[PDB]
Design brief:
Length: 67
RNA sequence: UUGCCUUUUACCAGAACCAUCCGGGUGUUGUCUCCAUAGAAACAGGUAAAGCUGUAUUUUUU
């Protein structure tokens, strides 16, 4: 259990870093700043995965406490 | 922080910080150079030349 805890923590940290980075990027993209074509694709990918995660979490929520 | 862009150098041109560099000033020492190269002149005056002053009838002195 302790290991599972620790890893859960560290991925939450990493996850936090990721999500915030993504958010920063998307504002940056909106602004129309210098940004790497590759970087923009990366951000698109991240934000998609993020969106899917959000979405299916909402599905879970819907299930877990009725319509 | 913007721009070109989009990958970095290289860059756009603004900011704030800072540094580098091309030079500069004096002052003092010292050297290098070109010229030099005297160990004593005044006083008494005269000569000539330079620095100031001078050319009584009510308050300065007639
Ligand atoms: Mg590469």
């Amino acid at each position: 259990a302790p290991i599972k805890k620790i890893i859960e923590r560290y991925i939450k940290s990493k996850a936090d870093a990721w999500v915030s980075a993504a958010h920063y990027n998307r504002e940056r993209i909106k602004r129309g700043a210098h940004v790497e074509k590759t970087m923009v694709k990366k951000n698109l990918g991240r934000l998609t995965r993020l969106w899917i995660k959000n979405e299916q979490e909402r599905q879970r929520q819907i299930q877990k406490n009725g319509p």
